[PDB]
């Protein structure tokens, strides 16, 4: 009830609610509340308070598990219980960059820079990298994007290109062209990357074919500036595409 009433105090209330559950001997329920706190929190300031309190809780139970296993004699499940809590504390600190980045993404899903930083943390783990590109493409509104949305698409295609998955990258570029971005320059830069990819792989006829479709005129003699027209239509005038 207080958490609904006192909307600004939440992280402090969670720690006080966890404290109650610690004293109840439901140490697992304390962990339940702290992860629930981490999920609900949307400021780094509150997150720091939850992280530090949870780590101290983790530290105190790890030390307690060390002492009790030595005093009581180590049953195999009891020694494994200690190894789990340490590994949960290892998980906690390693999750902390990802959680920190996620909190900023809770504040602004449009934060393309934090998406790049998320992938930068995911580095070496290809499936996590692939998924977070897909999530970025879904979540980010181009019209609200802080950091331009095509930069996601370029990195998305480049990752598959680095994996040699060129036809998948092409499908990514095809999907990219379907997007009506905030600005024509975003889509134009994609069309450049469509060409430039084929230049690297020397598929020069395909590069020409793509740019022929890119330059291809609307049935109207459309302006470069008319925002009511599809962004794909506007690209036909673009200085970059024609010069390339």
């Amino acid at each position: 009830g207080g958490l609904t009433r006192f909307t600004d105090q939440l992280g402090k209330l969670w720690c006080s609610l966890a404290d109650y559950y610690i004293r109840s001997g439901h140490f697992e329920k304390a962990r339940d509340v702290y992860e629930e706190a981490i999920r609900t929190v949307m400021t780094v300031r509150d997150f720091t308070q939850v992280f530090d309190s949870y780590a101290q809780f983790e530290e105190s139970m790890i030390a307690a598990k060390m002492e009790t296993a030595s005093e009581l004699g180590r049953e195999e499940e009891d020694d494994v219980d200690l190894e789990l809590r340490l590994a949960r504390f290892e998980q906690l600190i390693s999750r902390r960059p990802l959680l920190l980045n996620s909190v900023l993404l809770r504040q602004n899903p449009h934060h393309v820079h934090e998406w790049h930083k998320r992938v930068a943390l995911h580095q070496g783990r290809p499936r996590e990298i692939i998924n977070t590109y897909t999530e970025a493409v879904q979540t980010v509104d181009p019209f609200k994007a802080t950091g331009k949305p095509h930069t996601l698409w370029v990195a998305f295609a480049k990752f598959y290109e680095d994996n040699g998955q060129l036809d998948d990258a092409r499908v990514i570029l095809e999907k990219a062209t379907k997007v009506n971005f905030k600005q024509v320059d975003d889509l134009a830069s994609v069309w450049c990357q469509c060409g430039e990819l084929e230049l690297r792989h020397e598929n020069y006829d395909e590069a020409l074919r793509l740019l022929r479709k890119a330059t291809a005129l609307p049935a109207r003699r459309a302006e470069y500036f008319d925002g009511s027209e599809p962004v794909q239509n506007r690209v036909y005038k673009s200085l970059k595409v024609w010069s390339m």
Binding site: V44, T48, D52, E59, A69, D79, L86, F89
Partner: protein, 97 residues
């Protein structure tokens, strides 16, 4: 002997891992403090200050292009005239008119 020694060695490595993560928690405590005070700075700065900074960085990128032309050996004004497409000036005149 050895089994209890390994159990103590496992406990010691797990103590050292606990000590390492405790040190990492204190390192995180220092860095989170600095980042939340950096967040505090960002909150105490104007709400538009990063948008102003984004403008200033874009203006500095125009200044970087100016320096690039000067390094190549040409007046940036003359390069820009060579790089302008006339349709932009057309729209400008219509804004005036």
């Amino acid at each position: 002997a050895a089994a209890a020694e390994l159990a103590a060695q496992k406990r010691e490595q797990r103590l050292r891992k606990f000590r390492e993560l405790h040190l990492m928690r204190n390192e995180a405590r220092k860095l989170n403090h600095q980042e939340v005070v950096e967040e505090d700075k960002r909150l105490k700065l104007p709400a538009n200050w990063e948008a102003k900074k984004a403008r200033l960085e874009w203006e500095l990128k125009e200044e970087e292009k100016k320096k690039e032309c000067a390094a190549r050996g040409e007046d940036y004004e003359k390069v820009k005239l060579l790089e302008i497409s006339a349709e932009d000036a057309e729209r400008w005149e219509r804004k005036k008119k």
